[PDB]
Amino acid sequence: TVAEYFRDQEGQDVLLFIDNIFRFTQAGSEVSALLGRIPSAVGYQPTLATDMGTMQERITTTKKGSITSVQAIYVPADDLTDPAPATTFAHLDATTVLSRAIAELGIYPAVDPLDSTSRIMDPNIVGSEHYDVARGVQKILQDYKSLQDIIAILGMDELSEEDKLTVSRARKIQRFLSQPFQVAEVFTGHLGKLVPLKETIKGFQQILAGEYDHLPEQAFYMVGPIEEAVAKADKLA
Amino acid sequence: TTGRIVAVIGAVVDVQFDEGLPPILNALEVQGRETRLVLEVAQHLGESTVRTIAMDGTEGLVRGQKVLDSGAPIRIPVGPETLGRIMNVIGEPIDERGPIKTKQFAAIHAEAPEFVEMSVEQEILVTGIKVVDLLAPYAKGGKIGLFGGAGVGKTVLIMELINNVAKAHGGYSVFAGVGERTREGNDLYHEMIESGVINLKDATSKVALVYGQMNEPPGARARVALTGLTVAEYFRDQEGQDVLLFIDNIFRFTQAGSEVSALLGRIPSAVGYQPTLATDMGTMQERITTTKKGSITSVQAIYVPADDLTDPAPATTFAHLDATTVLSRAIAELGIYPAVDPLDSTSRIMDPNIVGSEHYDVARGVQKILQDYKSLQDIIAILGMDELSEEDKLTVSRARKIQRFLSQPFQVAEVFTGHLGKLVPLKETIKGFQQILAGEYDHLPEQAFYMVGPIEEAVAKADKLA
Amino acid sequence: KTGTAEVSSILEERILGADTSVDLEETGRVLSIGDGIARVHGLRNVQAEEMVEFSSGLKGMSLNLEPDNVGVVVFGNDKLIKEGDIVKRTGAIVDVPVGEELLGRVVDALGNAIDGKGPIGSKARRRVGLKAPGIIPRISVREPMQTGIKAVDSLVPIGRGQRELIIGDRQTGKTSIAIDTIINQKRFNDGTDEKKKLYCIYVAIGQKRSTVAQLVKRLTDADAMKYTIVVSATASDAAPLQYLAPYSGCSMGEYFRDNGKHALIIYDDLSKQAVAYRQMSLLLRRPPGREAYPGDVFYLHSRLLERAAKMNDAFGGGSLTALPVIETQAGDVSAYIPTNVISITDGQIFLETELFYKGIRPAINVGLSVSRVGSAAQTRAMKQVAGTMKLELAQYREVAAFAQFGSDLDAATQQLLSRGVRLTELLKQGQYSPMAIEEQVAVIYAGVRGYLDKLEPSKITKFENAFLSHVISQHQALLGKIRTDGKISEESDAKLKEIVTNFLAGFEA
Amino acid sequence: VDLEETGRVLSIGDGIARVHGLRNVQAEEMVEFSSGLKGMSLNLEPDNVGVVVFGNDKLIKEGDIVKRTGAIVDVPVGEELLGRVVDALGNAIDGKGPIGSKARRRVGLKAPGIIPRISVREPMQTGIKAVDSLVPIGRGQRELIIGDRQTGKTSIAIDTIINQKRFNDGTDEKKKLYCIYVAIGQKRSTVAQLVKRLTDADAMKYTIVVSATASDAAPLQYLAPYSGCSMGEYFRDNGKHALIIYDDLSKQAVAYRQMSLLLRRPPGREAYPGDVFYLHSRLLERAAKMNDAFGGGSLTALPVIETQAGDVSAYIPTNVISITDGQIFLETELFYKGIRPAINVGLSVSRVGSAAQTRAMKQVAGTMKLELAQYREVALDAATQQLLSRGVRLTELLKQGQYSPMAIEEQVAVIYAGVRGYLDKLEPSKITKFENAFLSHVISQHQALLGKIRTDGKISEESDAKLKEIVTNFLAGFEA
Amino acid sequence: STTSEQSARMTAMDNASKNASEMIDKLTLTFNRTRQAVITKELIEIISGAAALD
């Protein structure tokens, strides 16, 4: 209700942080029983969809401003078939699925890359340089997963070699996404390094170009733009 | 007060009590009831109605009947004359050797000592089973939870333990066959009598038998448990006597409870499991311990519902444990008797202190070996195995050997096994493993360790293999 | 309230003071009927557990004596009943007619000979409301009972009074097995083996009539039917009826037991019952629990099953031996009802399809097949060879485990396999294979002394028949003797052996 | 006659007294029964009062008069529970007669405000290297102790508690942490030993033990934490630092659900009622690290969760998880191996642990943590073999069994050694041995240094050179 | 050697699959069960394990 004021009235491009809608929904669900109502499967509140719907639809970009909605969604057991997230997606425009695995892979940004998506992306919209780089990236990495399966047989420095190159690249790529945090001296120690966009697209595009195919692999970890990663290799040796 | 059976809907007998009522728990005797059909008021169902539990059969009963409150809960004979008696829940000799004329009767709700009132300290008893002592040493008052399959020799094992212990330990016993297999009580009977653990020449024994067989109404089966419980406190405090309390099966108790809960038109929780699952236990378990006046050591059989332990019931169980022997079916299946799980056949109360620090360390090392070894199992399972590295392979073997060595023959089931049972002195055990830890049984194969007593005999056995 | 009784024929007179009806205490008017649970209004003085009779000739039982009405389990179908209907007590709970004039019958469990004799009804009835004997009443299962199935009789040798689970899948010869036994009991029953005057009770739970029909036909054929009740609750049934059937049998069999005779009940199967009953409960609303089953499905059964026993002397020492059946699905055992049953049953008989595909009918998982009972269930005859054999097989199997890198690793193990295999050949049995112990031990003997181990596996069987026909022919003497001495006597053995060696020589050559 | 403040026990389930009347009772009033029991008129039904009975009856028979006490519950709170075992009513099952706590405070009071609250910056330590190191921890903080059974778990809490001995018995005003052990559903025995243990260990003088043993009636067992909570706030808000160890909430929940169900107030997921996150949430939100107004005080929450087979996906665990500021996950295999710590480190978590602890440790620990990662990771290379060597050394080094707490400085010292690979020049068994000797060596000698290191709050470079030298001397000089 | 090895590689690769084959089978049970366990469990919740009996 407040934000709608600003949006329409104050025009504002609202950034709306919600942490977490999940708790709302959950709150709804909690009551559901006690509202006498049936809850739902997965415990929910039967009305969940509208609850959401009305809400999600409550907010938008009119031609009376925009509420840009940064909505934290706790995802229990990161289980997303977990009806709530399952629904959520419809109301999402860009889905950011943060991957605990990746987090575990030490990465910060710890994201789930392939599931942090926007159905939106396009070689038009984002330009193909963007798009394509991404599709290539998305591709290779998923394929790399296929390769993990190989590696399980074949080992830390033994495979089929082109494929090895790409593996290694994937290993760089991974690292290249890793990015410091100014806030988090506590998580990073580092201080944030921001990458202005082109430098990113290029960043990977270049990696894709394999221009560092002789550069160290984790000379990509916790960086800002790609140069600095190159720089970083030197800093080692 | 007198009540009228207003509903018998199954053995939930709703009696509306009409000369008032006493409080809950008060035991009612149904009037017109053939035998003494005690209904225990369970709830004041309200409106001077109680939900009560029949523990007898209700067949043929004219409803509308008249129940006369026995005015208190159920009291049952207490005093030593109960040792060498098979009592049913309601006292009543199902030894059927005629009465158990006791001087004391007791209402089966016995209580728990306040903190100050209970010896706040533990002991270390031991058992003579390698596997046990080593991994779960003993103590007194301690309730051990024993998992696995009756007559794998789960049940047998219990007996064997009794077999050495009651005799050896003076401090009395209670055996609670909750939903007991009547037959198993019979045989056992001829045996006990015979055995002179049960003495009939002297009504007493060293041990009182409580059987509350399966065919009893659940209420009875559920309640036979408190009954026994009441007794041991009698023995402890009153008789000094340090009961070993065999519960077979507390789960069967429980089952009777849950089943009951349901019928009690309550909400018996997840899986149907009684709301009160815990409270029944808590209240009960705390009626067990080493008080100052003795110890009621529980040997608690828990047969595993649908064989799962993540099952809340066992979850609960755990809270009260002192030692747990979780038999592994896998192990049992691996043709290992004892059937042990070597990962929660435990005592927290194994400490370098409680047992030898060595004992403990050796154990930790062992515990380790097994623990690591298991890790390999998965891998091995997938992948064949041999390139892990040999030391591990050694551990593996050792572990297996250890496994086999933990397999410890049993005389009582020599009949089956042809294996002469072995109850093992502590040293042989410690040593046993130490030797194995020293990995000396090089050449010597796995099966050279199967079903022996002291470790030498295994060494010997390898030789016998040769 | 319960809009029932707010029936304004019901209400409509209590109001008036114009009431007085059916009895509403010894008879009731069906408040509603649906669900086979005839809420029958009234029924107050109503006996508990009482069989009532409906105004349909259908029987019902007064399960829940509710203060208003009775949840009445219907012994029929309520397409054959309707609302309001007067249910008059029968006053009495269930007893089932019990006696002996059932041996030779296929009845419905309502004791009406669906065979087509109609009830050759027992004068007496005996309570299904009857319960298990006491500890003291029992004196141990020791009396064997041997099926004429070598494998069984040896390895999970069978006592009496017992309760042993028959477990196995979709007519994996399961029934075939049951028959071979039944036929086998014939000789004892054709003996006047009063110890083994084993009255067979076939509780058919849920079997569609045709399934029964071959089977019964088979029993007829085995003429074993003569000492046999076939308690029959077919697929066409109301559920309680299938449910009831064991209990019915239960009244009946304990009578033999208690009259010194030996009763055998085959419950085939409680799996269906359990379902049915659970369902029944559930239909009654009446709980479920684990696997949707009410918890007292255990009680139900437990209570049911304690009633099978091997008695003490008071009971003529007799038995009611239970061979319960559960038909497995994929050996599902934490399968609650299996879990239960296992803890109850005093060993269990595993059947395995593979073995079946192997032709090995019977299909047994021996390793698991266990007689918790074990030694008590035997005879020395068997004990003497079977002891070693069982053991030898144990090893064989262990080594059937260990048979695939070459088993020619050590001689023993190759051997164990060869030997084992020989024995394996022996333990497969045809369909319709009752057997006599002396042959069985004979045949075993041959193998455990390895003579057959000096023979090609195919010919083992071949021998076996031949050997049988041979010994039957000549060494009838000996067969008499093994039976006589009750064991393999060392002499009988020497003659036997001698026979074997010669016979073997004749068989092989 | 009050059927509007008093009631007649209409029906009593056996713990839920449906009480006819009571009306005028205010919601969530403690009532008192004519069985002498307490109750809470929890459920104000439009007819009768679901009164959760705070007692055990067969004393109640229907019609029993249920009397208002006329009070919404408060509990005695204070600071004199230190050296006391209590039950939630404020009675003291210690049998030390009754407590010294005397001010009473609603357990129903809620979560501090942001400004009242003041972020952690305040260390928190256990004498357990791994913990203090690998969890960087402050006070105020929720950290879940999660694990199945004292498997040292319970030990874990103890070593910490014991550790506080040096501090509370030190004049570490700031590290004067009132320990609140809410013992929820614990066998009396367990407690007995424990009680004894702690007593023997005497942390107990600066310690509340709220003891709701296994038997104890469920709402009570349930209540005990809230009680404890009120009491701990008592310190918190009063500048001081209380540590409540909620031990364990699994059992509380259970009880609670059960309670609900008996109130026929519905279940929820896993048959557990819907508020149950909330349950704790509100509870734990009442825990805080305060601002200055509260003397800066804190109530550090070490809630405990007992998992069932490490299953945490489990609604309630997830619940809890989503609240806590991390967890101490314990893994059996290592325990079982004898490795105490037994932890699954990965699973033990501090989202942002480091913002309320200590440079000393930090200086060695960050880097170390990482090395261990690397060491761990790799399921030969001299490096890796090294990491392994190190790692294993360090394993010993973080290995302090059950019954082993410490002053920090001792810990940093030994850690330092290990991080200098000094230890890698030793057989792993002898790390432990060495460590013992070494420790008594520095204790002896370089108590000087340790005193200082403790003093600098950090490790000085200078100290390092002395230390290096020390260590080396001991090292070398007892390397055999 | 190499012939041996390669032929051995088949062998190794067999071996693996024998193991596999079984497991695969077994898991499939584990499956049903966890499924059913599930299904059922909900069906409970469903069967007024969240309904009438909320």
Coordinates of C-alpha atoms in Angstrom, one line a residue, chain B residues 21-25 42-48 114-116 119-121 267 270 275 278-279 281-283 286 310 319 348 363-368 371, chain D residues 10-14 57-62 93-94 150 185-189 192-194 196 214-216 254 258 261 270-271 308-309 333 336-338:
Chain B
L21 CA -17.3 -40.7 40.3
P22 CA -13.9 -40.8 41.9
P23 CA -11.1 -39.3 39.8
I24 CA -9.5 -40.7 36.8
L25 CA -7.6 -43.8 37.0
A42 CA -9.2 -43.2 32.0
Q43 CA -10.9 -40.0 31.4
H44 CA -13.6 -38.2 32.8
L45 CA -15.3 -38.1 29.7
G46 CA -17.4 -35.6 31.5
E47 CA -20.9 -35.5 32.5
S48 CA -20.0 -38.0 35.1
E114 CA 12.7 -36.3 42.6
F115 CA 16.1 -35.3 41.7
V116 CA 17.4 -35.3 45.1
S119 CA 21.1 -41.6 43.2
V120 CA 22.4 -39.2 40.7
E121 CA 25.3 -41.4 39.7
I267 CA -5.6 -37.5 18.3
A270 CA 1.7 -38.9 13.2
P275 CA -0.4 -38.1 21.3
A278 CA 6.1 -39.5 25.1
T279 CA 4.4 -38.8 28.2
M281 CA 7.1 -43.0 28.4
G282 CA 8.5 -40.2 30.3
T283 CA 6.5 -40.9 33.3
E286 CA 11.5 -41.9 35.2
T310 CA 13.4 -42.7 12.6
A319 CA 15.7 -40.0 25.1
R348 CA 27.4 -42.5 25.9
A363 CA 37.2 -48.9 21.2
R364 CA 37.4 -45.5 19.6
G365 CA 40.0 -46.9 17.3
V366 CA 37.8 -49.8 16.6
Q367 CA 34.8 -47.6 16.3
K368 CA 36.8 -45.7 13.9
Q371 CA 33.2 -46.3 10.8
Chain D
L10 CA -16.9 -30.3 33.0
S11 CA -14.8 -33.0 31.6
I12 CA -11.2 -33.5 32.0
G13 CA -9.6 -35.3 29.3
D14 CA -6.8 -36.0 31.6
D57 CA -4.4 -35.4 38.2
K58 CA -6.6 -38.2 39.3
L59 CA -7.3 -35.6 41.9
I60 CA -9.6 -34.0 39.5
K61 CA -12.7 -35.7 39.2
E62 CA -15.4 -33.7 37.4
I93 CA 13.7 -29.2 42.0
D94 CA 17.2 -28.8 42.9
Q150 CA 24.8 -36.2 23.4
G185 CA 12.4 -33.8 28.8
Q186 CA 15.7 -35.1 30.0
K187 CA 15.9 -38.1 32.2
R188 CA 16.4 -37.1 35.7
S189 CA 19.4 -39.4 35.7
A192 CA 21.7 -36.2 37.6
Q193 CA 24.9 -36.9 36.2
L194 CA 24.9 -33.8 34.5
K196 CA 26.5 -33.5 39.3
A214 CA 11.6 -36.7 30.9
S215 CA 8.5 -37.4 32.9
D216 CA 7.5 -33.8 33.4
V254 CA 6.7 -32.6 20.6
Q258 CA 0.8 -33.1 21.6
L261 CA -3.6 -32.0 19.7
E270 CA 4.4 -33.9 10.3
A271 CA 1.4 -33.7 12.5
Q308 CA 16.1 -37.7 14.0
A309 CA 18.6 -39.2 11.7
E333 CA 31.3 -40.6 11.8
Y336 CA 32.6 -42.5 16.1
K337 CA 36.1 -42.5 14.8
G338 CA 36.7 -40.9 18.2

